[PDB]
Amino acid sequence: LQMIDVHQLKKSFGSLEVLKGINVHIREGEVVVVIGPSGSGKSTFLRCLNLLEDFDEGEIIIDGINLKAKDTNLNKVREEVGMVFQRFNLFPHMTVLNNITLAPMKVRKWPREKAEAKAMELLDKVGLKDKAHAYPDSLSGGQAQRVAIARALAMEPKIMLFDEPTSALDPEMVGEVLSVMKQLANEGMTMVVVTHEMGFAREVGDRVLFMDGGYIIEEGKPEDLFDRPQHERTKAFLSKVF
Amino acid sequence: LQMIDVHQLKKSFGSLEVLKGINVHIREGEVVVVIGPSGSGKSTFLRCLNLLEDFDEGEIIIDGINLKAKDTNLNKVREEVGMVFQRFNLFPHMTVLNNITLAPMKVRKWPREKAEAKAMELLDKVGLKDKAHAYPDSLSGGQAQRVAIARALAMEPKIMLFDEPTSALDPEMVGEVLSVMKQLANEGMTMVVVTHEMGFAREVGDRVLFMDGGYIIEEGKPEDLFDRPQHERTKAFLSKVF
Amino acid sequence: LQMIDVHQLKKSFGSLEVLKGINVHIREGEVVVVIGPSGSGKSTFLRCLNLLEDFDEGEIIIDGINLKAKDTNLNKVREEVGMVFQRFNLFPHMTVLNNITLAPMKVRKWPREKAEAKAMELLDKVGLKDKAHAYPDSLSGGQAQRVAIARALAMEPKIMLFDEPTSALDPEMVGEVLSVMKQLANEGMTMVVVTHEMGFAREVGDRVLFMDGGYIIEEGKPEDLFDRPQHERTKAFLSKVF
Amino acid sequence: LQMIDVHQLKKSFGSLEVLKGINVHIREGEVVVVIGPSGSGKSTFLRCLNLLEDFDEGEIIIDGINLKAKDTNLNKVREEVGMVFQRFNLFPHMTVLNNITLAPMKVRKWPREKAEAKAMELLDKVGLKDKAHAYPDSLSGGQAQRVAIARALAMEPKIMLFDEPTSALDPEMVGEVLSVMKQLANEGMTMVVVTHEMGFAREVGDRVLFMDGGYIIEEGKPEDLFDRPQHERTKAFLSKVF
Ligand SMILES: Nc1ncnc2c1ncn2[C@@H]1O[C@H](COP(=O)(O)OP(=O)(O)S)[C@@H](O)[C@H]1O
Ligand SMILES: Nc1ncnc2c1ncn2[C@@H]1O[C@H](COP(=O)(O)OP(=O)(O)S)[C@@H](O)[C@H]1O
Ligand SMILES: Nc1ncnc2c1ncn2[C@@H]1O[C@H](COP(=O)(O)OP(=O)(O)S)[C@@H](O)[C@H]1O
Ligand SMILES: Nc1ncnc2c1ncn2[C@@H]1O[C@H](COP(=O)(O)OP(=O)(O)S)[C@@H](O)[C@H]1O
Questions:
Q1: What is the 3-state secondary structure (H, E, C) of B97-162?
Q2: Do C49 and C192 contact (CB within 8 A), yes or no?
Q3: Are D40 and D89 a contacting pair, CB within 8 Å?
Q4: What does the domain layout of chain D look like in residue ranges?
Q5: What's the CA gap between D189 and D197, in Å, rounded?
Q6: What is the three-class DSSP state of A136?
Q7: Relative to the CA of A45, which ligand 1 atom is closest?
Q8: Contacts of D69 in chain C (CB under 8 A)
Q9: Is 3.40.50.300 the CATH number for B1-242?
Q10: Measured between CA atoms, how close is B172 to chain A, in angstroms?
């Protein structure tokens, strides 16, 4: 039924409880956009979904695989979840092409040639096939972020997580990244995107999750939550940032 | 998380097992369209959601109310779920106005004045204000189905069930009913619609459920399931519709 | 002057030269019927006149506007040319009415009321006023093709292109479509029609263009070209529709 | 009559309508400054003039060339319009000289000697003739922006666009760049400058365009618009600036 099933997820960092009982259902092929004030645990939530973070209480089931089960291979689960961070996504001492074939070649044992062809295909999809042999330090922010997306997709994941991938870029470079993300959404990839770009949220998001202080205060279709919020805290957040 | 939660639902008629274990998650505000071969249990399924049919196995929770809770709770489920049939939704020997107010007054103990006011606003919603005092025998099939909707809505339900609502209608009379259902969808009503109007599904439906022989064989976004069906039984059914 | 002026038009799809020097003059109000063997470039020619294809060599002037001039707005020219394809002409997720008012409201900025009123006039003209609120999937081939025509005319174009609009229809629904086309011809609309229905060409065509292998082998009034063709290739082709 | 002619321009990202109908007339030789609240669409507007962004409605004509004209023709627009961004204008891994000659040689097919002669002439223009063989990492931010201008100018554009050209600079380095831009203005260049440097605007601008939420709320001579604004939105923004 769901590609991502989260039940009463709780997470603390010592004395500080960040996630206070998150409940989420995301269907395969759905694009879920997460918004909310800072410190609400948006990034922490993504990190949990990417297995970069252990969790205290709750249950997380990815593609029918409970992360707490005996027979669960967490590295295998980590193979089906791709993630793009706000900033440093590439190894600097590696070329674009090699950054992309590294995991597929190691993890999925693809021969160097099967990996590189797939990488050239993803580079073309993001419009940077000509940068295959360049190093990250020579890319613009917008180009590096697109390559970061190609790299994550090279593992052919079932889910793609995005933690404010454009929040850092200058306005000129924002579109080229969102454009790739939109293209990716039209392809049926299950996506979870933390972002402040409400235009992208409305246009390509299937559902929006309003996270505030460790809780999902409201949930709903973009149109319904942005223009018909049902909770004052939601209207509050939406008004102040407008 | 879900207005309608269905788990491993099974329904048999002694020997005949109509529902072979279906699972469904419908969120508040979603419009779900159900399509599939005859004898697949689509209608029986709806009648289980409305407590019109009892089930042998599985679990059903509507708006947080389990369908196996005390009757007193089941009554609120009954009141909160509205349903429109192929035909026969109105009492033929009763005016349009009286058909609409009957249940609110009798069940919700609403007073005459409040019930009629609501009924009149609803007649405006479906475009049949001037038909308030007419009898069903004086309405076209298209106007009768619209009155059926206003009647189901008079109870202020949180969910609206439609079982092939326009199927008994001439093609010329289908649009006006679909138009009203679309308006209801835009207002955020949780809807479960069993229909053959595929165009309507593409425009108004959030998800489509393909049922075949008592099983939910495929589920997905209308465009995805319609244009790029993944399972063979789905493809087979669509090759007869498209 | 000349509603359509094409000089030495050449078109290639890679190393495949499809049109190799097309020359055509079509004055306003003329109904030009294009015939010829398969793969002659008939559809390609129409695609070019509708700006769906960029051409390699030659000139194309639509109502005095050269498509290669620096001050030419190619989009404004596309607004002037309506097209009806052999098959998929309507958005499946929209009603008949909404299919027709989409471009007029979006492109010509007509308020909903002015667009819908004009859409109803056209629906009536094509005899489908009672289908305004129906969806494409509920239409027969014949009805859908007539709505496709109604839709194209909604933009009030100066030219109407038809790529074998009845070739796909059963012989039962061919009539209603040609009928609308005949009525459109009687109204003075400049038309270009690719068709195999030679009965329509003789009756409504002001001129017939015999295309073969990317060249216009012969041109002339229907009677003259069908009854007394001058080129043996023209006679060869006509004797075979026999 | 206008080097830049913009009519009812609209640009949207889903429901987000960034530009809501902009009309702009800029004559050859005028210097137009654009000011306004963040999110008004100032940068998006400039990106439309340089064919970096595509638009939904209305039309743009640059130097008699329409932006919806054939490509081979749009390339001439791209060549005639230069632009300086707030930060990333140069390739950090190549020298000042090579940065300036790159496009001229690659795009305009200018030979090396001609390209370098022009680059040297332009370096004298911006006052960095001794920086020809330096790398961007050895230039102050102010020197780098002056090189960005020389670089944009090497293509001999008819129009120069500036998107907050000095905004990322220390107040101490803002003057040297404004000085170059002032010189460029005295030379008769058509310029569009999105900037917060009001003093510069009063001296160098022929007109000012105040943008607010996708609209050009007010326009006029710098002194008139700044010192005696007519509209409330204009007054409101200015109370935050002066
Ligand atoms: N590793 C670690 N160790 C200790 N504390 C952490 C850690 N990571 C986050 N935090 C804190 O958790 C809160 C949510 O961070 P989050 O970034 O998830 O909030 P948003 O993404 O909503 S801004 C915020 O105070 C972060 O400072
Ligand atoms: N009361 C009763 N008693 C015995 N059998 C019944 C009964 N009611 C239904 N059936 C049968 O259930 C199947 C699904 O009906 P359903 O109408 O749910 O299929 P669809 O809605 O998909 S056409 C089909 O064979 C119906 O003949
Ligand atoms: N997009 C594209 N890409 C590659 N090739 C194409 C394309 N479109 C057409 N062709 C070919 O051009 C020829 C004429 O097609 P045309 O349909 O114009 O011939 P008729 O209309 O006379 S049957 C025939 O081989 C078509 O296969
Ligand atoms: N690619 C993309 N996708 C979605 N939304 C976008 C995109 N690009 C811009 N926008 C938005 O356009 C608005 C104006 O940006 P503009 O930078 O033109 O405002 P100013 O220059 O006035 S600060 C603002 O909300 C920007 O967030």
A1: HHHHHHHHHHHCCCCHHHHHHHHHHHHHHCCCHHHCCCCHHHCCHHHHHHHHHHHHHCCCCCEEEE
A2: yes
A3: no
A4: 1-242
A5: 19
A6: helix
A7: 18
A8: 69-74
A9: yes
A10: 32
